[PDB]
Each structure stands twice: as structure tokens, then as C-alpha cells.
């Protein structure tokens, strides 16, 4: 097995959204019968590839087709200004990409914003989803115990307005439990993605100005989900409180929640092996 | 491979406790470099064999020696009236058995009272334990959200006082999320273990009368634990509140918590397959 590469799996497709046509980027990996979509977080400089670099190969080696969608406003995809539901917007784009590639069912691994988007997608088109895996996100709403805006979201919002190296370091320093895990390659890739697309950073800020609540609260509709769901969270997540994971657990019947204590807001990376093993086990369930 | 039988693995050993010598029973299954000790709950009629019937074989087949200890006051072991710390009494007994069996290290799977016991043991003899797995128990203390005595505990205490088939069904009815799980076989074996040793039932009530707080609150000392720990819980556990699992999680560094939503107080049984998978993976980590 030869590890996958970004350039080799890179692809584009057009999607119709609100009367306008936008070019959307995504990485297509492997060819398996079952497909697994990975939706990135909302950090500045984030892309499907950089977010899931440590989880792509275990999925392909296992025989899954892996697609990492870069939501508009991030990566090589066109930028956009969202004044409505960010969650539903991305879900719409994924829907188009999925229909065009003629893919019937998909498993979802949503990270942070990706989690909200996966729940939105599953809520809208349940018949098009197999299993759902949520990490650090999934539903909008208030935390019962942690102050908001959270310590992390403040640094993320600040970085977006002032895309400096210092703010990138300020944000990432509390993004993961053990910063010794952050690599220079990782850091440099984000920074490069940040500075290479200032149109994204500017539109993200504008989206917040146009609509402060980018993510709907799907709480009351969680009873609708029939997909076998697995929720993953870090106990020390400083961006999205852990009790959000508890809410998702209480709302989705038959779900399970796995919490890593020594972990921040990026479990798929901080505890990659434990994570990839949980996911593969989960995805293999009947 | 032939499934393990309670009759074939049955064994006894003598342990010195409080100046007296009590006959302790336990089932010794399989062979393997590493040994996994399983500690049963505190329900009337409970035994190591009955509690872990769905976990013994996958454990043995994975290549572990499995010891199921029936703590004094339960099963074929001698009875006892405990006015001190239950968790510590049990850990002493295990310490004796493990020294007598010449076993250097042990992995632990503690169920409810068993979890409290595994933590007591790990706190006293950290050098003798490998990995720590706690299910529905581990530390005394108050719940932050659920009323105590809990709905489940009131029925467990009622059963001990008045050992009737009606009260056994009543306890079990809220012991698991899906009562369709309970088998006539499981029930009958429970009834037998209960009515068989009325001395145990009587001594449990006497112990409670002698000492209302059978389990010490290990919260302040949880930071002493260095064992890689895995905590498992049922969101709908009506005997021991799930936030107790959260406490273990926050207090034990490097630990992980896995919660089953549609699960009561007996996850090892209710979600046997997924539980065994979680444990085997866990036990296999370096
Ligand atoms: Cl991100
Ligand atoms: Cl029990």
C-alpha cells in the first residue's frame, strides 16, 4: 500500500448555490465500495487534507473510498460570505458533490464545523447516510457549564481579524492538550493556507458580521437521527465545551461517546491511533 | 476453543483477614503472560462468573489468564460483616490471592463495587497493576446532578432486606436499558445465588447497619493513579449516576471514558460485543 498524496487525489467540481456557481475542491482517495466523507473544522488555514492527514490512510487501507471536501470559504474552493446556516450550506455542497459522483451512501466523519455539517446533512438526507462520526462538534447551542464565547473561539475570531503568526501561535497553543504534538510542517501548512487566501479570512469575518449565529441548534431534532452515531471529544477542549458532546449523546438514540481526558479540540490528531481504531471498529459494525 | 465452564475453573484459597482466616473462591481461566482480574458488583446473588459470563471467553481467547474473584460476602466465598472500607477489604483479599498465585502484574476490570475495589487496589499497590478498566464504579462521593440514594440503589437495598422473586425482578427491571436482554437463565442463576446463601444477604444488611459508607471517596487521591485507565458507563444507569464516570475521567490522568447511551448499569453485558472490543483493544495497547 502506497500512502495517499494530496496532489494525486485532488479534484474539482462545480456546485450551484443561491443562483451562483462555485468551484469546489475535494480529495478523492481509494476506490472502495463504501465511501467515507471527512469534513474539516473552521480554523483559519484549515483544509480537508491538513485536518485529516493522520486519518486518511487507515481508512483507504481498510478499503474505503475517502473524500475530503473543502467547504466554500476554505482551501482551494471558492470563497463565500455566509449569512445563513453555515452547517446547511456545507451540507448542500456535499449533496451536490455526492450526487455528481453518483455516490449512493456515505459515512461521515465531521470535525467541529464538519460535525455540525454532518448532522445537518444527515438531518436533511437520512437515506444517503450510513454511519455518523462526530468530533468536537455537531449541534449549535449553549454550554451548561463553560463560559462563552469560549477561550478558544475568542482566539480563533481574533486570528481571523488579524492573520499574524503570533495569533496563529496563540490559537494553536490552546488548540491541543500537548502542544509538543504540533509540528512545524503542520504549523507552516496552516500559515501558508491562511496567507495564501486572504479572501477566505475576510469573508469569514464578514459572515460573522452578517450573521453571528452561524450554527443552528439541532437539539430538538436529534431524535430524528437513525444513523448509528459515534461522538468523540477531548475533556480539555477549550474551543467547544465537552458537555456539547454530552448533549449529542443524550439526543441521538443508540449513540456512544468516547472522551479522551488529555485532549484538546483535535482528537483525530492528538489521539490518532486510538481514534482511527475507534472509527474503523465503528465503521465495520453491521 | 471450548467455552470456559464455572465448574472446571472453580478454585479456593485461604486468606488472612482481620485476625481470621476466610475461605475465598474464584475461577481461574486460561493461560497467558498477562493476567486479567475481574471484580463483580454488589448485587444480591452476584458472582464473578455471573457478572462476566459474556466477557470471560473473548478475554481467554485473546490470550489472557482470567481470574474471577468472589469477594467475601458473595458467591461460594465465606461470608463477612464489614464495618470498614469494602473497597479495601476486597483489594486485600485480591492481594493475598495474587501473591499466593505468584502473579507479578494484573490488568483490572472492576464492575461497580468491583471498580471501587480495583481503584482501592491500584492506589495501594500501583506496582502490581497493568491497565485499569472501570465500569459503573470507581470512587465514592456525591453525584452533582442525580438524587441519592438513587432509584436503583433503593431497590438493591430493598432486595437484600426482603429477598423475594418480585424484588429481584424489580431490581433487574431498572438495572438494564433493554430488559429484553435478561434471560430466564440469567434470572434463575441469580435467584439461586441469592436464596442459596442467605448468610451473605444478612451480612450485607448488617454491614450497612455497622457502616453506612462502605465505599470511601477516592476523589482527592485519583491523581496518584498512573495506570492507563479506561472508564465505561451507561448514560441511563439508574444505580450509579454517569457523572461519577466524569469524575473518574477528570481525576485520572491519561484516562478515557466511553459512554453507551442506551445502556443501564451493566454495560459489559448490555453492550458485550462493543465492550469486549473496547477492552481487548485497550488491553493490547503498549
Ligand atoms: Cl480547524
Ligand atoms: Cl451486581
**Whose grid coordinates read 482511527?**
A276
**Full DSSP string of A71-106:** -TTSTTS-----SS-HHHHHHHHHHHHHHHTT---E
Q: B230 C-alpha to center of ligand 1: Å?
A: 28
Task: Give Cβ neighbours of residue A83 (< 8 Å, ≥ 6 apart).
Answer: A207, A210, A211
- Which residue, among B261, B272, B282, would best test binding to A if mutated, counting the most A CBs under 10 Å from its CB? B261
Out of B255, B256, B259, closest to residue A249 by CB:
B259
Cα Rg, chain A, nearest whole Å: 17
- Between the alpha carbon of residue B275 and those of residues B29, B138, B267, the distances in Å are 19, 17, 7
| Choice among B107, B116, B265, B271 that is catalytic | B265
Taking the C-alpha atoms of residue B245 and residue B136, their distance in angstroms, rounded to an integer, is 7
Q: B54 C-alpha to center of ligand 2: Å?
A: 14
- Which residue, among A225, A243, A256, A279, would best test binding to B if mutated, counting the most B CBs under 10 Å from its CB? A256
Taking the C-alpha atoms of residue B279 and residue B274, their distance in angstroms, rounded to an integer, is 9
Domain range annotation of chain B: 1-286
Q: Which residues of A touch B261 (CB under 8 A)?
A: 249-250, 252-257
CATH class held by domain B1-286: alpha beta
Tell me how close the Cα of B277 comes to any Cα of chain A, in angstroms.
8
C-alpha cell at B3: 467455552
Between chain A and chain B, the number of residue pairs with CB atoms below 8 A apart is 47
CB A129 within 8 A of CB A122: yes
DSSP character at residue A128: G
CB A150 within 8 A of CB A264: no
CB B227 within 8 A of CB B129: yes
* Total residues found in chain B within this entry: 286
Experimental technique: X-ray
Quickly list H helices, A132-265.
151-161, 165-173, 184-196, 198-210, 243-251
Residue B265: active-site member: yes
What does the H/E/C string look like for chain B?
A: CCCCCHHHHEEEEEEEECCEEEEEEEEEECCCCCEEEEECCCCCCCCHHHHCCCCHHHHHHCCCEEEEECCCCCCCCCCCCCCCCHHHHHHHHHHHHHHHCCCCCEEEEEECHHHHHHHHHHHHCHHHEEEEEEECCCCCCCCCCCCCCCHHHHHHHHHHHCCCHHHHHHHHHCCCCCCCCCCHHHHHHHHHHHHHCHHHHHHHHHHHHHCCCCCCCCHHHHHHCCCCEEEEEECCCCCCCCHHHHHHHHHCCCCEEEEECCCCCCHHHHCHHHHHHHHHHHHCCC
Q: Which ligand is nearest to the CA of B115?
A: 2
Amino acid at each position: 500500500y502506497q500512502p495517499q498524496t494530496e496532489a494525486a487525489t485532488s479534484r474539482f467540481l462545480n456546485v450551484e448555490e443561491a443562483g451562483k456557481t462555485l468551484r469546489i475542491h475535494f480529495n478523492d482517495c481509494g476506490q472502495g465500495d463504501e465511501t467515507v466523507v471527512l469534513l474539516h473544522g473552521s480554523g483559519p488555514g484549515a483544509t480537508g487534507w491538513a485536518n485529516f492527514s493522520r486519518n486518511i490512510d487507515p481508512l483507504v487501507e481498510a478499503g474505503y473510498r475517502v473524500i475530503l471536501l473543502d467547504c466554500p470559504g476554505w482551501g482551494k474552493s471558492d470563497s463565500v460570505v455566509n449569512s445563513g446556516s453555515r452547517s446547511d450550506l456545507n451540507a448542500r455542497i456535499l449533496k451536490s458533490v455526492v450526487d455528481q459522483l453518483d455516490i449512493a451512501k456515505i459515512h461521515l466523519l465531521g470535525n467541529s464545523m464538519g460535525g455540525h455539517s454532518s448532522v445537518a446533512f444527515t438531518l436533511k438526507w437520512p437515506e444517503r447516510v450510513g454511519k455518523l462520526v462526530l468530533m468536537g462538534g455537531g449541534t449549535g447551542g449553549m454550554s451548561l457549564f463553560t463560559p462563552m464565547p469560549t477561550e478558544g473561539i475568542k482566539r480563533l475570531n481574533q486570528l481571523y481579524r488579524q492573520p499574524t503568526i503570533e495569533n496563529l501561535k496563540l490559537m494553536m497553543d490552546i488548540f491541543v492538550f500537548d502542544t509538543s504534538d504540533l509540528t512545524d510542517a503542520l504549523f507552516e501548512a496552516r500559515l501558508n493556507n491562511m496567507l495564501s487566501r486572504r479572501d477566505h479570512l475576510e469573508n469569514f469575518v464578514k459572515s460573522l458580521e452578517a450573521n453571528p449565529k452561524q450554527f443552528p441548534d439541532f437539539g430538538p431534532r436529534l431524535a430524528e437521527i437513525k444513523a448509528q452515531t459515534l461522538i468523540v471529544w477531548g475533556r480539555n477542549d477549550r474551543f467547544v465545551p465537552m458537555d456539547a458532546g454530552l448533549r449529542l449523546l443524550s439526543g441521538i438514540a443508540g449513540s456512544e461517546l468516547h472522551i479522551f481526558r488529555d485532549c484538546g479540540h483535535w482528537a483525530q490528531w492528538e489521539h490518532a491511533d486510538a481514534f482511527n481504531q475507534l472509527v474503523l471498529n465503528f465503521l465495520a459494525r453491521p
